[PDB]
């Protein structure tokens, strides 16, 4: 998968995983419907909990998405925010970045995620592996070899991060 | 190591002294009680008997049976005496056991440290002797 995805010939496409949550909510409710707990001795009926689950699952299922795409085509592309049907966000550079973000718990354990920053863009969350730092800017250089724009790091500029397009 | 045991035995005997002479007149209602059925009355009776019984508590053998035999005293809400003897036995036993094992471990540590520095010195002396032997061979 290491040499398949970072090349990313021309455009990239992206989706959301909320359909998984909607399908799981539907499965859980359909389990809850037939032969649930019989708590009439509790002087109550708990059908409204799966009813509210159905409201939530139906609303989450309504979040349809055709293949969130940009103009990351390996050219002088505008990085115009593209969706099958409607289009919203357009900007001449200086907005599409890739930024490393950090999160901490009460203990102090650090979790590292990555986000393609821009006007209502999609993130670049990696597949469930953030305990060590590894290589940092190697995938950043791969993104640069794609269509070099930015590779931002945490906190301010300082050092250890590279920029390619600036608006001054 | 017993040469190094210069102040720990003094503190041990002085803590023994103060706690024993304190605990003479604490369970003063035990030996000086007119209960016919009792078998540990002579433990707290005399000062030397008090020394013997607090050494027994220091060794921590049958402290449960001892306390159950002092439970035959009229229970005065156990507010000062039971907590005093329990704190004495636990604090003395754990503190002095830990301090003596720590001191003997430190004795072994410094014995091995002196050994380590001594073969270190022997090795650098041997290396210097080898270098001076090469110097003597070259000078000839």
């Amino acid at each position: 998968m290491c040499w398949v995805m970072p090349p990313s010939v021309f455009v990239l496409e992206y989706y959301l995983d909320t359909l998984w949550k909607g399908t799981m909510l539907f499965i859980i409710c359909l389990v809850f419907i037939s032969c649930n707990v019989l708590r009439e001795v509790k002087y109550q009926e708990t059908w409204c909990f799966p009813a509210y689950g159905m409201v939530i699952g139906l609303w989450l299922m309504l979040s349809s998405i055709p293949q969130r795409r940009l103009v990351l085509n390996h050219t002088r592309g505008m990085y115009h925010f593209s969706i099958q049907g409607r289009t919203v966000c357009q900007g001449p550079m200086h907005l599409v970045y890739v930024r490393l973000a950090l999160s901490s718990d009460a203990y102090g354990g650090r979790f590292f995620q990555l986000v393609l920053c821009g006007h209502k863009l999609e993130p670049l969350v990696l597949v469930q592996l953030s305990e060590r730092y590894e290589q940092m800017e190697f995938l950043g250089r791969h993104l640069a070899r794609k269509l070099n724009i930015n590779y931002f790091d945490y906190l301010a500029s300082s050092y250890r991060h590279v920029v390619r397009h600036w608006p001054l | 190591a017993l040469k190094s045991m210069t102040f720990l035995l003094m503190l041990l005997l002085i803590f023994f002294y103060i706690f024993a002479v304190t605990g003479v007149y604490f369970f003063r209602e035990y030996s000086r009680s007119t209960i016919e059925g009792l078998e540990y009355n002579m433990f707290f009776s005399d000062l030397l008997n008090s020394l013997v019984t607090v050494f027994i508590l220091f060794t921590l053998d049958h402290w449960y049976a001892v306390l159950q035999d002092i439970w035959k005293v009229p229970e005065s809400s156990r507010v000062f005496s039971s907590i005093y003897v329990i704190l004495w036995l636990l604090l003395g036993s754990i503190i002095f056991r830990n301090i003596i094992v720590a001191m003997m471990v430190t004795n072994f540590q410094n014995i091995r440290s002196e050994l380590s520095e001594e073969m270190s010195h022997l090795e650098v002396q041997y290396k210097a002797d080898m270098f001076k032997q090469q110097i003597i061979q070259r000078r000839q």
């Binding site: 999160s103 901490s104 718990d105 009460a106 986000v115 821009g118 006007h119 863009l121 993130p123 | 049958h62």
Partner: protein, 250 residues
Amino acid sequence: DVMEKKDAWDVQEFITQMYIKQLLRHPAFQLLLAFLLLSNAITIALRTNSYLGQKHYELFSTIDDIVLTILICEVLLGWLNGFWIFWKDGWNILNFAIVFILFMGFFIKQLDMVAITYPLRVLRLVHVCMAVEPLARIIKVILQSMPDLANVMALILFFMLVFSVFGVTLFGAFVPKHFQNMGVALYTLFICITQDGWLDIYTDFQMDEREYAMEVGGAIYFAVFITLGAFIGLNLFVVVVTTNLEQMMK
């Protein structure tokens, strides 16, 4: 860098930053939670007494509900940051299990009784108190030391089995009721390994043939085995303790 205008994910990370800023870094909220938990601990210590519980049972039920709802609120707030990180944690699993068992026994009928309600509360007391620093190092090194304790325990038990064969050859139906039953025999051997008050056992097998008999042999074999095993166990315990504690000192 300059960050002329923030985006949606910067907003989300900022919101999570304020979410972890409170109740995770603020000493006031943790202090209030510790105060409430110490108060219900005091009420726990006020139990074992019906003379107090007759005017306190309704208040005990109310404070039970209060501590349960603040516990589940804390668990929900922890789940807000993500179910994956809360499920994949070394210690949050324990608090989740504690609140799950307590709430399952509370809302649904259960045979859990006080023997579940109170120990779970004091487990939560411990889990709150270790978060405040000056016992966290000691509990951390205790849980670091236990995997090295495991091998010593396993070796001790295996040696005690392979010597309990020699034991049970002279056990059962004679000097009985503590050397019989092959597991009560094992646990009586363990009692003697703990090395306190075996003179009852010494008088138990006393007077076999009143001078030597096997009164010499079995007693001396078992006694030298007991003293060797007790020394080995106590040593191996303290040395594993100091070995895993040297990892702390590094």
